[PDB]
Amino acid sequence: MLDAFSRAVVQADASTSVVGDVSALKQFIAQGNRRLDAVNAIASNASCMVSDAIAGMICENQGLIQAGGNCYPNRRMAACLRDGEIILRYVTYALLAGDASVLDDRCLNGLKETYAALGVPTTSTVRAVQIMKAQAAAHIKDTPSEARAGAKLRKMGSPVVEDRCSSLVAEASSYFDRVIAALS
Amino acid sequence: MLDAFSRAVVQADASTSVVGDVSALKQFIAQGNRRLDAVNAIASNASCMVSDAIAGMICENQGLIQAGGNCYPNRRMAACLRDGEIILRYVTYALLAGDASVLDDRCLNGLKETYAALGVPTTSTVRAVQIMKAQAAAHIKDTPSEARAGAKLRKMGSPVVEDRCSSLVAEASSYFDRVIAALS
Amino acid sequence: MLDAFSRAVVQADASTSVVGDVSALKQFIAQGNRRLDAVNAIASNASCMVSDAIAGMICENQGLIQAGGNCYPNRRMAACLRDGEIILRYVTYALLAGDASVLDDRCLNGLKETYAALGVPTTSTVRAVQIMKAQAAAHIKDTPSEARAGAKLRKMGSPVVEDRCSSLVAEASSYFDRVIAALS
Amino acid sequence: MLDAFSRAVVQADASTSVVGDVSALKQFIAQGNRRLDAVNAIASNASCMVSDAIAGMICENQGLIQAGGNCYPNRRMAACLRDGEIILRYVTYALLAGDASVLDDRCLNGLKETYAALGVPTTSTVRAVQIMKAQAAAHIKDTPSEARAGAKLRKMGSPVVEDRCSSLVAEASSYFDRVIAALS
Amino acid sequence: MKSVVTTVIAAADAAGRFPSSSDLESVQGSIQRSAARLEAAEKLGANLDNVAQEAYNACIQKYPYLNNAGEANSNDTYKAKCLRDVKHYMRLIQYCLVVGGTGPLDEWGIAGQREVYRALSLPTAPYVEALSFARNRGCAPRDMSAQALVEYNALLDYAINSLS
Amino acid sequence: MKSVVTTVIAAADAAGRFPSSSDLESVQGSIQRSAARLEAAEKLGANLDNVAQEAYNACIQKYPYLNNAGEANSNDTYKAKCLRDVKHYMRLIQYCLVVGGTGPLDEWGIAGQREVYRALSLPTAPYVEALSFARNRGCAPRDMSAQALVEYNALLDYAINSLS
Amino acid sequence: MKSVVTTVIAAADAAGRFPSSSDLESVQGSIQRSAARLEAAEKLGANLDNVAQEAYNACIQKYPYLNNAGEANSNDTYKAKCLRDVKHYMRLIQYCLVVGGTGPLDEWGIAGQREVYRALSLPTAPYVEALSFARNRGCAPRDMSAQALVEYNALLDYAINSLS
Amino acid sequence: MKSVVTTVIAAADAAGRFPSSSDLESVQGSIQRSAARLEAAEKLGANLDNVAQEAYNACIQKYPYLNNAGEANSNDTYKAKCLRDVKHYMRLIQYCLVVGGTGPLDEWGIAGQREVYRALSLPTAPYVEALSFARNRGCAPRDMSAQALVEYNALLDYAINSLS
Ligand SMILES: *C(=C)C1=C(C)[C@@H](Cc2[nH]c(/C=C3N=C(/C=C4\NC(=O)[C@H](C)[C@H]4[C@@H](*)C)C(C)=C\3CCC(=O)O)c(CCC(=O)O)c2C)NC1=O
Ligand SMILES: *[C@@H](C)[C@H]1/C(=C/C2=NC(=C\c3[nH]c(C[C@H]4NC(=O)C(C=C)=C4C)c(C)c3CCC(=O)O)/C(CCC(=O)O)=C2C)NC(=O)[C@@H]1C
Ligand SMILES: *[C@@H](C)[C@H]1/C(=C/C2=NC(=C\c3[nH]c(C[C@H]4NC(=O)C(C=C)=C4C)c(C)c3CCC(=O)O)/C(CCC(=O)O)=C2C)NC(=O)[C@@H]1C
Ligand SMILES: *[C@@H](C)[C@H]1/C(=C/C2=NC(=C\c3[nH]c(C[C@H]4NC(=O)C(C=C)=C4C)c(C)c3CCC(=O)O)/C(CCC(=O)O)=C2C)NC(=O)[C@@H]1C
Ligand SMILES: *[C@@H](C)[C@H]1/C(=C/C2=NC(=C\c3[nH]c(C[C@H]4NC(=O)C(C=C)=C4C)c(C)c3CCC(=O)O)/C(CCC(=O)O)=C2C)NC(=O)[C@@H]1C
Ligand SMILES: *[C@@H](C)[C@H]1/C(=C/C2=NC(=C\c3[nH]c(C[C@H]4NC(=O)C(C=C)=C4C)c(C)c3CCC(=O)O)/C(CCC(=O)O)=C2C)NC(=O)[C@@H]1C
Ligand SMILES: *[C@H](C)[C@H]1/C(=C/C2=NC(=C\c3[nH]c(C[C@H]4NC(=O)C(C=C)=C4C)c(C)c3CCC(=O)O)/C(CCC(=O)O)=C2C)NC(=O)[C@@H]1C
Ligand SMILES: *[C@H](C)[C@H]1/C(=C/C2=NC(=C\c3[nH]c(C[C@H]4NC(=O)C(C=C)=C4C)c(C)c3CCC(=O)O)/C(CCC(=O)O)=C2C)NC(=O)[C@@H]1C
Ligand SMILES: *[C@H](C)[C@H]1/C(=C/C2=NC(=C\c3[nH]c(C[C@H]4NC(=O)C(C=C)=C4C)c(C)c3CCC(=O)O)/C(CCC(=O)O)=C2C)NC(=O)[C@@H]1C
Ligand SMILES: *[C@H](C)[C@H]1/C(=C/C2=NC(=C\c3[nH]c(C[C@H]4NC(=O)C(C=C)=C4C)c(C)c3CCC(=O)O)/C(CCC(=O)O)=C2C)NC(=O)[C@@H]1C
Ligand SMILES: *[C@H](C)[C@H]1/C(=C/C2=NC(=C\c3[nH]c(C[C@H]4NC(=O)C(C=C)=C4C)c(C)c3CCC(=O)O)/C(CCC(=O)O)=C2C)NC(=O)[C@@H]1C
Ligand SMILES: C=CC1=C(C)[C@@H](Cc2[nH]c(/C=C3N=C(/C=C4\NC(=O)[C@H](C)[C@H]4CC)C(C)=C\3CCC(=O)O)c(CCC(=O)O)c2C)NC1=O
Ligand SMILES: C=CC1=C(C)[C@@H](Cc2[nH]c(/C=C3N=C(/C=C4\NC(=O)[C@H](C)[C@H]4CC)C(C)=C\3CCC(=O)O)c(CCC(=O)O)c2C)NC1=O
Ligand SMILES: C=CC1=C(C)[C@@H](Cc2[nH]c(/C=C3N=C(/C=C4\NC(=O)[C@H](C)[C@H]4CC)C(C)=C\3CCC(=O)O)c(CCC(=O)O)c2C)NC1=O
């Protein structure tokens, strides 16, 4: 797998050139502590995210939990919770690395054809991934609502900036959009 | 795998018949010593053949050793030198056996599709094998040129015949052409 | 595994010196054709030898084919026949090679302890090996009795000498003796 | 495996108590950069340490490279070079960890019995380790001699203190002494 | 025992590698982060009884049915074992803060927890509530520095994640 | 297909080796022995029908019960298939003499023979007697040279050993 | 491609884990060390031709026999490829300083080097002497900061170690 | 130890077979070729010291840099070990001529040779030049019979190939 730095290196190698301009890479380093905060915010809330996101997909689509539904019976529901967890885990790896390589290579490559072969619905998987994307943006900004979270609300208490790490929120959202793109 | 004799057996079995003309197999046996000298001449010169054949292919196409070239970087050059040794090893087996069966079954079968998947260039592979064909011809004739060998020139000292084993030259040449045919 | 020749090399390597006298090895080559006849004589008669040896061990020890006997029931008889064939096979490899190395290393090493752990009886195993020793001696000399063979008598038609290859008989016999010594 | 901090945890756990005094652990952290210098100094010089240690062992005992000696022939000298590298590697792991656990569990456990079965001699293995101990000491202190290194001399250019990391020299030396104790 | 240094050593050893640049650079991270988590370890080590007592109280506060005859907090032995369990978790967290990885929680708390609580009919929700209270209770700088609290909270959330 | 050269090639390939000294030396063995075994191949190829017919006749003479209604030699289809089987073994022996290994007997004769004869209730003993008669029958120099006969007898004994 | 973050991701993924405390701590290491190795990367990037040139010159000065007809530096094609090879290694080192691990050198330098130089009969010692010269040449703070030079030298020694 | 007879025994044993026609035929090769290789072994054995001495002298003559301070032929210990090594290769070649296979050279010369020469900074070209000289030097019948010289030369080429 590649990270932010090894991506730059692979690009320099394609013209057997030295890495010329490490200015973007120093800005990546100046952003390092907020990146570790962003990852901490997802990993620390991962069980609540996966459970609320699958529960969300289901509260919208009651078909999935009846006869012939793909979260019926118990075994299928467990399998689906496991995929929500796996997809969030690989998105979190990409955010820590600052590159989509690990998500592409280890999670998304062949995933649509696997889902088509098992008869796992695309459209429902994408809805679960969209809720996790919103959850992640909220937890990175540290503005989760008491309305969504109730007794399970968590605050991270990271040093506040007025944009609330909008750049890390867009990058994370981009990784989730890559899963949604690969699955539809 | 088969050898010259079991090939005649397979052909005879195709019509549930005895092997008919054993007189003509006695002549293959009479050529036997010169067959072992031809094998000895390729095996004994195999490092000098492979390195000269791969350096030849490269000296005609500098693209192989530049960014994007399939002999760049070190890993890819090393894989290619390995392939040249593998191909020549299976050709020498086919020469010792007087049949292409072992070459076909253990080397050529699937080689085209393997190279297409890896993006190994067919053109440059063919040129490597062409130079190996020419080298083998000269080593079986025991007429390598000082021009191509310099200080690595080797003479084998076999009993000289007028044709210089023209039949084994043609046989060995058909095995290299068999490798090249297997890449299309 | 060693043969008669690598045995001399291992002896010479213990003093990091050249093999000095090859005269003993030249006598081994002059004996070569009779050695191939001796191996041919055992291999060609091996089924007859193993069944006749195991049936002899049994005809002299009827307890083996009664309740609690180690050739009872069918599974154990089969295993015994297999063991006779294995031991004769490794003796025949030693005779082909002209060294006990393959017999010691691949057959005898740990065999006595294996038998102890299984409760395979020593005296009966040794008896079966003594009968095979006598059979092999008779097939090597090409003097099997009709009394012992009835309708299964085989003659080899090797060029006859006065000693009837007494040196190969003694060598073959010493290999059978190593089995009896390893098991008793 | 354990490190210096999980070693203190395992001790506190033996009386189900909190880790009470962090100050010793605070001093480990403050020593941390010189520890990475010490690991750098060994790892950067490892090939030169292994070849000079095995050469020095042989320097002191010509037996190892004569008929019947345990560094003869080439396969055995290679095996010995390989063991030297393995032992130094696990010692370098213990020094990075600040605990002998990985060295005990992955290298030393069964090693005496392994060397016993193989006939690898204890005196000479202990002598190679004693030279590696002295080389590691000089590299951690950054006082290697030109007299022992020639053209291969390496200076690390670390910030010099009076004691030249005498505590790390002692610790790394005690890991080499655990190898010696395990072989005794 | 998973830590910065045991992770890089396990990775080097699987590849037959001496420690290299990326390995040393990982351990420099331990040097940087140590001051945060060792502060959290000292504050937690010094006040473990009172921290665990109020977290145990909070979990019983949410689940008063545990006090009714027959439930898991309903006698003096049960009470003492419940508080002990909360103290065990907070002790392993103190160990994680000392080590800078989850090793002590993974090996000594999490491994076998669901088999144990299943077999003894101990519900998981009160364990979760005790840790959840502890996660939500701390503030900086009253209880420890900001980054000490980040380290403390992350390990509480890791234990909660393990039971959720 | 097991012969001298396929055995050394298979051994060379399993080790990633070019042909070496022992491989060439092995094949010199084929050059030397070929005269004896190709003489036997020529004689057997030229006289296969007569050789097999008389081996078939020996097994029926030994086992006349095969002629009784319901037994394996009892009708004209059964007699033709039995003579044909004897000829198949002898033709495979001719192939082994051509090749100088047991490959053809192994692959096309022995493999499956036990399962076929079990399934068809074809007794083994008549096959063994046909090949036994063929083994005992030849003499040098009447039929072929002494070493041609050794080669012929050795493959007949190999065939017998596969059914014994 | 081995760096701090890919080593911890690969270890996390093998055990099916989310990033945890030891994984973020490792990456803090990369944040700390980035300044030193990114300094070395810029110095090396800006002056690669000059740094490589004096290293190549040093290796030909130590081994003039290379200039003899038939030897590895004995015609201008060979000469230009030799300097090119020294610059290749220095470029892969610049890549390692950017990434903060050995991946670029491991994957594009060291893999297959032994097999390539053996087949083309390229002596090892002149590569070792070029890198050795570059390793002994630097001093701080003249050429870069002390810790920039530790990072530069570590990768030069890593490369020397691969050829020794 | 790879020979004609150990190659066919290992093949028979992996298949659970008695020696058969292709095995005996293989060993007749040894009976046929033994006269040439035993002759080569007697000639090389009788004159090992002078054969190795001129091969050693030729490789130092090609590479006089080895004589300079700090190079591999620069002291009398190194000088004596270099000639010893050439002698070792020639001795193992004698063993290969006695055995009629490459076993002795494979096990005692070739296995580990690359790790040993790398670790001690011994360049391989002078080993190749010693063997290459020995390969070009012999002629028949002056030194041994023509077929003896084919066997001697094949084993030198095998050794050259192992280092090339
Ligand atoms: C053979 C005749 C013989 C030897 C071979 C040699 C073995 C030996 N070496 C030491 C001590 C060291 N060797 C070192 C190695 C190196 N230094 C470097 O700069 C490079 C990177 C590397 C490889 C050459 C080092 C660092 C030492 C430590 C001492 C020093 O630097 O001077 C010893 C032990 C000496 C002691 O106990 O102090 C031995 C035996 N000795 C031979 O006689
Ligand atoms: C666990 C409680 C986390 C947490 C999770 C968050 N949920 C967020 C958004 C969100 N959740 C759902 C599912 C929910 N809605 C339903 O109608 C039902 C079923 C009846 C369920 C299970 C949805 C649909 C959404 C979408 C909102 C959107 O698109 O933006 C969320 C982000 C929004 C917010 O915080 O308000 C979070 C963070 N939050 C926590 O604090 C704990 C740890
Ligand atoms: C969006 C992600 C957030 C946000 C993040 C910020 N955090 C800032 C600084 C900061 N964070 C940490 C913790 C981090 N570093 C580590 O080494 C580890 C774990 C091993 C973690 C979890 C540290 C140490 C720091 C720096 C300390 C300090 O200087 O106080 C930060 C301020 C700096 C910046 O501008 O990038 C921000 C913005 N802040 C937000 O607004 C949302 C919620
Ligand atoms: C084309 C290949 C050659 C050529 C070859 C000839 N070699 C001839 C005879 C011959 N070769 C050997 C060595 C060989 N037999 C073995 O047993 C082994 C190894 C185990 C090897 C390497 C021998 C023993 C012999 C026979 C003895 C002799 O003739 O002195 C030969 C003559 C026989 C034939 O025509 O088949 C030829 C032609 N000759 C050429 O002109 C080119 C260079
Ligand atoms: C198979 C028929 C071979 C063959 C076998 C030979 N048997 C030889 C000796 C031998 N056989 C037995 C066992 C036998 N004697 C019994 O009393 C009973 C059962 C009541 C049996 C089954 C014994 C005891 C011996 C004597 C061994 C000894 O001296 O210790 C033998 C060698 C001696 C000889 O030939 O007279 C052979 C060769 N002979 C053949 O021709 C076919 C192919
Ligand atoms: C004791 C074992 C025997 C006996 C053996 C003799 N055989 C003699 C010569 C001989 N044998 C073979 C066949 C052998 N060589 C092969 O290449 C193969 C198979 C590939 C086999 C099975 C041959 C070719 C020859 C040489 C030709 C000949 O001389 O007829 C032989 C005579 C030579 C000598 O004295 O060593 C003997 C003595 N003779 C006996 O008395 C017992 C029964
Ligand atoms: C949940 C949001 C879905 C849903 C999911 C299901 N997944 C099922 C099986 C399954 N999923 C994968 C892909 C997964 N495994 C991986 O290794 C990775 C990446 C590393 C991922 C993302 C696989 C390979 C499999 C098959 C193997 C297995 O069972 O573990 C599944 C079970 C189907 C069945 O067996 O009947 C389900 C139900 N289903 C839903 O309704 C929502 C939309
Ligand atoms: C050299 C003349 C070529 C060239 C060669 C490359 N081959 C690469 C890898 C490769 N080759 C094979 C086929 C090979 N292996 C076998 O087992 C057999 C037959 C028994 C043969 C002939 C395979 C399966 C592979 C993949 C596995 C491996 O890495 O060894 C290769 C590397 C591709 C890559 O990974 O990037 C190259 C470069 N390339 C050239 O430019 C010339 C024309
Ligand atoms: C016959 C002369 C004996 C006798 C023999 C039995 N052997 C039994 C099993 C057995 N034998 C071996 C050794 C065998 N296998 C090898 O791999 C080798 C050498 C390479 C040899 C010689 C083993 C390992 C085993 C166990 C595995 C298996 O069943 O194949 C056996 C069965 C014992 C039992 O299970 O009860 C018997 C009966 N028995 C006799 O009475 C005579 C003296
Ligand atoms: C040696 C002098 C014997 C002996 C031999 C006799 N065989 C006779 C007839 C015969 N043999 C065969 C089989 C034979 N011919 C082949 O083509 C092959 C193998 C390829 C072999 C081994 C046949 C087919 C025949 C019938 C036709 C013919 O005669 O060739 C024979 C004539 C009388 C008879 O049929 O028995 C003799 C004398 N007989 C002896 O008593 C000594 C020991
Ligand atoms: C420390 C005072 C040393 C010392 C240093 C000197 N080096 C000199 C010149 C020099 N160094 C390099 C390599 C250097 N430049 C880079 O770009 C990098 C890495 C990216 C390195 C490590 C070069 C190319 C040159 C020539 C041009 C230049 O940079 O000046 C130097 C000037 C005189 C000379 O070349 O010797 C000095 C004094 N020399 C010492 O005596 C101590 C130990
Ligand atoms: C600039 C790059 C460049 C190269 C690397 C060579 C590569 C090369 N070698 C040969 C051709 C050959 N090369 C060898 C090789 C050898 N002869 C011996 O005596 C040794 C044992 C062994 C290693 C040197 C042989 C035997 C031939 C056959 C032709 C001949 O010998 O003249 C040919 C001719 C191919 C043909 O006819 O199609 C070519 C192009 N040529 C180039 O222009
Ligand atoms: C995890 C830890 C670990 C190790 C430390 C090694 C331990 C080890 N070493 C050897 C292997 C060996 N070890 C040596 C080494 C020596 N001979 C000498 O004369 C010197 C005194 C000494 C070097 C200092 C030798 C010579 C052999 C081969 C012995 C033989 O095969 O005859 C072997 C047998 C397998 C092989 O051939 O490689 C093993 C298991 N391996 C491991 O997995
Ligand atoms: C990733 C790689 C990495 C490293 C390799 C280290 C490198 C490193 N070492 C030190 C710092 C140091 N380095 C040493 C070490 C030594 N001094 C001696 O006299 C001995 C020769 C040697 C024995 C070990 C010392 C003594 C210091 C000064 C600080 C101290 O006293 O501990 C410093 C702090 C800055 C300074 O004080 O200059 C750093 C960053 N850190 C890293 O993160």
Neighbouring C-alpha atoms within 13 Å toward the C-beta of F105: 27
Q: Which residue in the block uniquely carries the two structure tokens 């703070």?
A: G141
Asked if C50 contacts C85 with a C-beta cutoff of 8 angstroms, the reply is: yes
Q: What is the DSSP letter of E18?
A: P
Resolution to 1 decimal place, in Å: 2.2
Q: Which atom of ligand 4 lies at the shortest distance from residue H154's CA?
A: 22
| Terminal Cα distance for chain A, rounded | 24
User: φ and ψ at A118, to 5 degrees?
Assistant: -80, -20
3-class SS of residue D150: helix
Rounded Cα gap, residues E9 and E4, in angstroms: 9
Structure tokens that stand for E126 in this block: 């009160």
Concatenating the DSSP letter of every residue in B102-155 gives HHIIIIITTHHHHHHHHT--HHHHHHHHHHHHHHHHHHHHT---HHHHGGG---
Which chains share 3+ C-beta pairs under 8 angstroms with H? B, C, D, F, G
φ/ψ bin of G106: left (φ > 0), alpha (ψ from -120 to 50), beta (otherwise):
alpha
Pairs of CB atoms within 8 A across B/G: 37
Which residues on chain B are in Cβ contact (under 8 Å) with F27? 32, 35-36, 96
Determine how many CB atoms are found less than 10 A away from the CB of residue C75.
8
Residue nearest to atom 35 of ligand 11 (CA): G137
| Terminal Cα distance for chain E, rounded | 23
Q: What is the residue type of C155?
A: K
G19 to chain E, any CB pair closer than 8 A? The answer is no
Closest listed ligand to the CA of B122: 8
E9 to chain G, any CB pair closer than 8 A? The answer is no
Q: Establish whether chain E is in contact with chain B, requiring a minimum of 3 CB pairs below 8 angstroms.
A: no
Asked if C80 contacts C70 with a C-beta cutoff of 8 angstroms, the reply is: yes
Q: What is the DSSP letter of F67?
A: G
Asked if F62 contacts B36 with a C-beta cutoff of 8 angstroms, the reply is: no
Which of H6, H13, H95 is facing C3, going by the closest CB pair? H6
Structure tokens that stand for D99 in this block: 């605990």
DSSP count for chain H of H helices, then E strands = 8, 0
Contacting residues for H25 by C-beta, under 8 A, at least 6 apart:
F4, F29, F30, F33, F100, F101
Q: Which atom of ligand 3 lies at the shortest distance from residue E154's CA?
A: 22
Residues of E at the A interface (Cβ-Cβ below 8 Å)?
Answer: 135-136, 139-140, 146, 149-150, 153-154, 157-158, 160-161, 164
Please tell me whether the peptide bond between D159 and the residue prior to it is cis, using omega within 30 degrees of 0. Answer: no
D76 lines ligand 13 (CB under 6 A): yes
Residue nearest to atom 20 of ligand 3 (CA): G25
Nearest C-alpha in E relative to G21: E101
- E strand spans, E98-159: none
Structure tokens that stand for G55 in this block: 């290293």
Task: Tell me the CA–centroid distance for residue D19 and ligand 7, in Å.
Answer: 44
Q: How far is D25 from chain E (nearest CA, A)?
A: 8
Which residue out of A6, A47, A49, A52 would a mutagenesis test of the E interface target, given it has the greatest number of E Cβ atoms within 10 Å?
A47
Q: Which residue among B74, B75, B118, B131 is best mutated to probe the pocket of ligand 8, counting the most ligand atoms within 8 A of its Cβ? A: B118
Q: How far is D116 from chain G (nearest CA, A)?
A: 30
Please tell me whether the peptide bond between C144 and the residue prior to it is cis, using omega within 30 degrees of 0. Answer: no
φ/ψ bin of B110: left (φ > 0), alpha (ψ from -120 to 50), beta (otherwise):
left
Give CA torsion, residues A72, A73, A75, A81, to 10 deg: 40
Q: Which residue among A57, A59, A148 is best mutated to probe the pocket of ligand 2, counting the most ligand atoms within 8 A of its Cβ? A: A148
Determine how many CB atoms are found less than 10 A away from the CB of residue C156.
20
Task: Kindly state the helix (H) or strand (E) to which residue B56 belongs, with its residue range.
Answer: helix B46-59
Rounded Cα gap, residues D44 and D144, in angstroms: 13
Structure tokens that stand for F52 in this block: 């097999």
Q: Establish whether chain E is in contact with chain F, requiring a minimum of 3 CB pairs below 8 angstroms.
A: no
D34 lines ligand 14 (CB under 6 A): yes
Q: How far is H157 from chain B (nearest CA, A)?
A: 5
Q: What is the DSSP letter of B158?
A: P
Give CA torsion, residues A37, A38, A40, A46, to 10 deg: 160
H147 lines ligand 4 (CB under 6 A): yes
Asked if A124 contacts A61 with a C-beta cutoff of 8 angstroms, the reply is: yes
Asked if A44 contacts A38 with a C-beta cutoff of 8 angstroms, the reply is: no
- E strand spans, G4-163: none
Contacting residues for D25 by C-beta, under 8 A, at least 6 apart:
D4, D5, D8, D19, E34, E38, E98
Rounded Cα gap, residues A43 and E158, in angstroms: 8
Task: Tell me the CA–centroid distance for residue D165 and ligand 11, in Å.
Answer: 29
Rounded Cα gap, residues A154 and G115, in angstroms: 57
Would you give the distance in Å from CA D179 to the centre of its chain? 8
Q: How far is H123 from chain G (nearest CA, A)?
A: 7
Rounded Cα gap, residues E100 and D98, in angstroms: 14
- E strand spans, chain E: none
| Terminal Cα distance for chain G, rounded | 23
Using CB atoms and an 8 Å cut-off, which of residues 6-35 of chain C contact chain D? Answer: 13-16
Asked if B1 contacts B101 with a C-beta cutoff of 8 angstroms, the reply is: yes
3-class SS of residue F163: coil
Task: Tell me the CA–centroid distance for residue D34 and ligand 14, in Å.
Answer: 4
Task: Tell me the CA–centroid distance for residue F10 and ligand 8, in Å.
Answer: 22
Would you give the distance in Å from CA G119 to the centre of its chain? 23
Would you give the distance in Å from CA F56 to the centre of its chain? 14
Rounded Cα gap, residues G164 and D48, in angstroms: 8
Contacting residues for A150 by C-beta, under 8 A, at least 6 apart:
none
Rounded Cα gap, residues H130 and D11, in angstroms: 62
Give CA torsion, residues C103, C105, C106, C109, to 10 deg: 100
Asked if H124 contacts G125 with a C-beta cutoff of 8 angstroms, the reply is: no
Q: Which atom of ligand 10 lies at the shortest distance from residue F40's CA?
A: 20
- Please give the C-alpha separations between residue E160 and each of A52, B173, E132, E153, H63, in angstroms, as whole numbers: 16, 72, 7, 10, 71
For residue C80, give the nearest of C119, C110, C108 by alpha carbon: C119
| Terminal Cα distance for chain B, rounded | 23
Determine how many CB atoms are found less than 10 A away from the CB of residue G25.
28
Q: Which residue in the block uniquely carries the two structure tokens 């290992």?
A: H10
Asked if E45 contacts D132 with a C-beta cutoff of 8 angstroms, the reply is: no
HEC readout, chain C:
CCCHHHHHHHHHHCCCCCCCCCHHHHHHHHCHHHHHHHHHHHHHCHHHHHHHHHHHHHHCCHHHHCCCCCCCCHHHHHHHHHHHHHHHHHHHHHHHHCCCHHHHHHHHCCHHHHHHHHCCCHHHHHHHHHHHHHHHHHHHHCCCCHHHHHHHCCCCCCCCCCCCCHHHHHHHHHHHHHHHHHHC
Residue nearest to atom 23 of ligand 10 (CA): F51
Rounded Cα gap, residues D107 and A126, in angstroms: 49
Across the interface, whether the CB atoms of D44 and G149 are under 8 A apart is answered: no
Q: What is the residue type of B119?
A: G
Contacting residues for B160 by C-beta, under 8 A, at least 6 apart:
none
Asked if F3 contacts F99 with a C-beta cutoff of 8 angstroms, the reply is: yes
Rounded Cα gap, residues C3 and E99, in angstroms: 60
For residue B99, give the nearest of B174, B14, B23 by alpha carbon: B174
Determine how many CB atoms are found less than 10 A away from the CB of residue B110.
9
Asked if E6 contacts E103 with a C-beta cutoff of 8 angstroms, the reply is: yes
Please tell me whether the peptide bond between C159 and the residue prior to it is cis, using omega within 30 degrees of 0. Answer: no
Asked if H101 contacts H1 with a C-beta cutoff of 8 angstroms, the reply is: yes
Rounded Cα gap, residues G86 and D70, in angstroms: 39
Nearest C-alpha in G relative to E96: G21
Which residues on chain F are in Cβ contact (under 8 Å) with B13? 95, 104, 108
Rounded Cα gap, residues C161 and C76, in angstroms: 43
Length of chain H: 164
For residue E162, give the nearest of A41, A93, G18 by alpha carbon: G18
- Please give the C-alpha separations between residue F97 and each of B33, B84, F39, F104, H7, in angstroms, as whole numbers: 20, 36, 9, 10, 22
Rounded Cα gap, residues A176 and A127, in angstroms: 11
Structure tokens that stand for B53 in this block: 């054949």
Rounded Cα gap, residues A181 and A166, in angstroms: 22
Asked if C65 contacts C58 with a C-beta cutoff of 8 angstroms, the reply is: yes
Across the interface, whether the CB atoms of G4 and E27 are under 8 A apart is answered: no
Task: Tell me the CA–centroid distance for residue C159 and ligand 6, in Å.
Answer: 6
Rounded Cα gap, residues C18 and D108, in angstroms: 40
Rounded Cα gap, residues H58 and H134, in angstroms: 9
Would you give the distance in Å from CA A146 to the centre of its chain? 22
User: φ and ψ at F157, to 5 degrees?
Assistant: -65, -35
Using CB atoms and an 8 Å cut-off, which of residues 105-164 of chain H contact chain F? Answer: 151, 154-155, 158, 161
Q: Which atom of ligand 3 lies at the shortest distance from residue G25's CA?
A: 20
Determine how many CB atoms are found less than 10 A away from the CB of residue C27.
11
3-class SS of residue G89: helix
For residue C93, give the nearest of D146, D81, E57, H18 by alpha carbon: H18
Q: Which residue in the block uniquely carries the two structure tokens 């021009």?
A: B147
Rounded Cα gap, residues C129 and E29, in angstroms: 72
Task: Give the burial string for F86-95 (b: 16+ CB within 10 Å, else e).
Answer: bbebbbbbbb
Give CA torsion, residues A161, A163, A167, A171, to 10 deg: 100
Domain extents for chain F?
1-164
Concatenating the DSSP letter of every residue in A10-62 gives HHHHTTT------HHHHHHHHTHHHHHHHHHHHHTTHHHHHHHHHHHHHHH-G
CA angle A119, A122, A127 (to 5 degrees): 135
Q: Establish whether chain A is in contact with chain H, requiring a minimum of 3 CB pairs below 8 angstroms.
A: no
For residue G110, give the nearest of A30, F62, H5, E17 by alpha carbon: E17
Q: Taking each helix axis as running N to C, give the angle between helix C74-97 and helix C122-141, from 0 to 180 degrees, rounded to the nearest 10.
A: 50
Please tell me whether the peptide bond between D73 and the residue prior to it is cis, using omega within 30 degrees of 0. Answer: yes
For residue G95, give the nearest of G105, G85, G106, G109 by alpha carbon: G105
Experimental method: X-ray
Residue nearest to atom 4 of ligand 2 (CA): A149
Across the interface, whether the CB atoms of B47 and H164 are under 8 A apart is answered: yes
Asked if B45 contacts H157 with a C-beta cutoff of 8 angstroms, the reply is: yes
Asked if H4 contacts H26 with a C-beta cutoff of 8 angstroms, the reply is: yes
Closest listed ligand to the CA of B68: 8
Identify the sign of the CA torsion E132, E133, E134, E139.
positive
Q: What is the residue type of F105?
A: L
Structure tokens that stand for H124 in this block: 């391989």
Rounded Cα gap, residues B153 and B138, in angstroms: 11
Q: Which residue in the block uniquely carries the two structure tokens 């000079």?
A: D52
- Please give the C-alpha separations between residue C74 and each of C64, C69, F161, H49, in angstroms, as whole numbers: 12, 11, 21, 65
Closest listed ligand to the CA of E36: 3
Length of chain E: 164
Structure tokens that stand for B121 in this block: 């260039």
Q: Which residue in the block uniquely carries the two structure tokens 């080559």?
A: C29
Contacting residues for B100 by C-beta, under 8 A, at least 6 apart:
B94, B174, B175, B178
CA angle C53, C58, C59 (to 5 degrees): 95
Rounded Cα gap, residues H68 and B152, in angstroms: 27
Asked if A55 contacts A77 with a C-beta cutoff of 8 angstroms, the reply is: no
Asked if F9 contacts B93 with a C-beta cutoff of 8 angstroms, the reply is: yes
Rounded Cα gap, residues H5 and H30, in angstroms: 8
